[PDB]
Amino acid sequence: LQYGPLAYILGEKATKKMTEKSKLITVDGNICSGKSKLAKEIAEKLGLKHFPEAGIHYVDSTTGDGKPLPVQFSGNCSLEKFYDDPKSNDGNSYRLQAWLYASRLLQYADALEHLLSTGQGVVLERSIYSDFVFLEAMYRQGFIRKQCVDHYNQVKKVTICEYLPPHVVVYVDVPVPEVQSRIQKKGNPHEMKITSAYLQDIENAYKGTFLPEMSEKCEVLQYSAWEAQDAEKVVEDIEYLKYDKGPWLDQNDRKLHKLRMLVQDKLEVLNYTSIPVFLPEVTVGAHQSDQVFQEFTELPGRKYRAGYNEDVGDKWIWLK
């Protein structure tokens, strides 16, 4: 029985599988701040599904066979190419950011769908709420134009409002001089080109806008570089939180029915990520968009709806 009004009427309600342990945790932080390690530990010490940070190819992992698709089907946006030539004239800087916001928006919907359907909590590296720190980091370095920020805010103000903020925000703070050092140790040829001004702007966005804005509706835990290494301390603090603010208190089976209907319809989630604002960075011509679409339908298991592809081993199509 696929979820819908009939399932909700027959008993499938959100406040029958959610418990005190059904929480949504996002582990924010700067580059090389150790969040990926901390978040992976919080999830396993609380029985929570873990979501690795949404990258360029996140959507591919959740659809089809799970393997990444050729980059042409992601818009050719590259994180490696962003570091080398952040001032590129082909708009790869903003077209990267716009694609990443959609990926996080898609991931956040998948997380909420898991929390509501199964009742199990989830841990995210970053979220649509914190994703703007990179945008104003790009803008303040001159990597993107103002029209790119205006377009970004238009997409955010029509998509963010439809969802609920995380229960707990975990911020791992690492000063910029230390972050530069940790970037060098991993020694990624493209990442090492990151400038300290870019890293500093991320913190200013994190410090000035994200934390003071999420603290009035979420539980905020601001650890440091040394404190973050103590996972048992983090799990202990989270389990002692009070949860006395934010919109998750003013929710019922009726409101969560609407939320689940939206988050299971992925085309509905991504509806305004492609609004007809003709920004050069994200606009694609009709000839190139047409050519790529035809190539996409020729990939294995993509021509038809899932379960109707006879070239990947689907049978009973004539009775299905």
Ligand X SMILES: CCCCCCCCCCCCCCCCCC(=O)OC[C@H](COP(=O)([O-])OCC(O)COP(=O)([O-])OC[C@@H](COC(=O)CCCCCCCCCCCCCCCCC)OC(=O)CCCCCCCCCCCCCCCCC)OC(=O)CCCCCCCCCCCCCCCCC
The length of the chain in residues reads 320
Instruction: Confirm or reject binding of residue 11 to ligand X (CB under 6 A).
Output: no
Q: Which of residues 123-182 bind other proteins (CB under 8 A)?
A: 154, 158, 161
Instruction: Indicate the residue whose CB is closest to ligand DGT.
Output: 36
Provide, rounded to whole angstroms, the least separation between the CB of residue 158 and other proteins. Answer: 4
Nearest approach, Cβ of residue 268 and other proteins (Å) = 7
Q: Which two tokens stand for residue 26?
A: 């996002």
Q: Of other proteins, Mg ion, ligand DGT, none, which one sits near residue 289, judging by CB under 5 to 8 A according to partner kind?
A: other proteins
- Name which of 111, 117, 118, 125 is nearest 41 in CA terms: 125
Q: Which of residues 45-104 bind other proteins (CB under 8 A)?
A: 59-60, 63-64, 73-75, 77, 89-91, 95, 98-99, 102-103
Nearer to other proteins, 130 or 264 (CB): 264
Scanning residues 228 to 287, which ones bind ligand X (CB under 6 A)? 261
Q: Does 33 bind other proteins (CB under 8 A)?
A: no
d(CA 296, CA 60) in angstroms, rounded, equals: 12
The reply to whether 293 sits near other proteins by the rule CB under 8 A is yes
Helix (H) or strand (E) holding 186: helix 176-186
Q: Should residue 86 be labelled a site residue for ligand DGT when binding is judged by CB under 6 A?
A: no
Q: Does 199 bind ligand DGT (CB under 6 A)?
A: no
Q: Is 283 in the site for other proteins (CB under 8 A)?
A: yes
The structure tokens listed for 56 are: 């360029």
CB atoms inside a 10 Å sphere around CB 13: 18
Q: Which string of DSSP letters, residue by residue, matches 38-101?
A: HHHHHHHTTT-EEEPPP-TTHHHHHSTTSPPPPGGGGTS--HHHHHH-TT-TT-HHHHHHHHHH
Residue 306 Cα distances to 28, 56, 60, 248, 302, angstroms:
35, 22, 14, 35, 8
Nearest residue (CB) to ligand X, 9 versus 197: 9
Token code pair at residue 273: 């990520």
Helix H or strand E encompassing 27:
strand 24-29
> Under the criterion CB under 8 A, does residue 306 sit at the interface with other proteins?
yes
34 and 174 Cβ atoms separated by less than 8 Å: yes
Binding site for ligand DGT (CB under 6 A): 29, 31-37, 53, 79, 82, 96-97, 100, 131, 134, 191
List residues near ligand X by CB under 6 A. Answer: 5, 261
Where does this chain bind other proteins (CB under 8 A)?
A: 5, 8-9, 59-60, 63-64, 73-75, 77, 89-91, 95, 98-99, 102-103, 106, 154, 158, 161, 254, 257, 264-268, 270-276, 278, 280, 282-294, 296, 302, 305-306
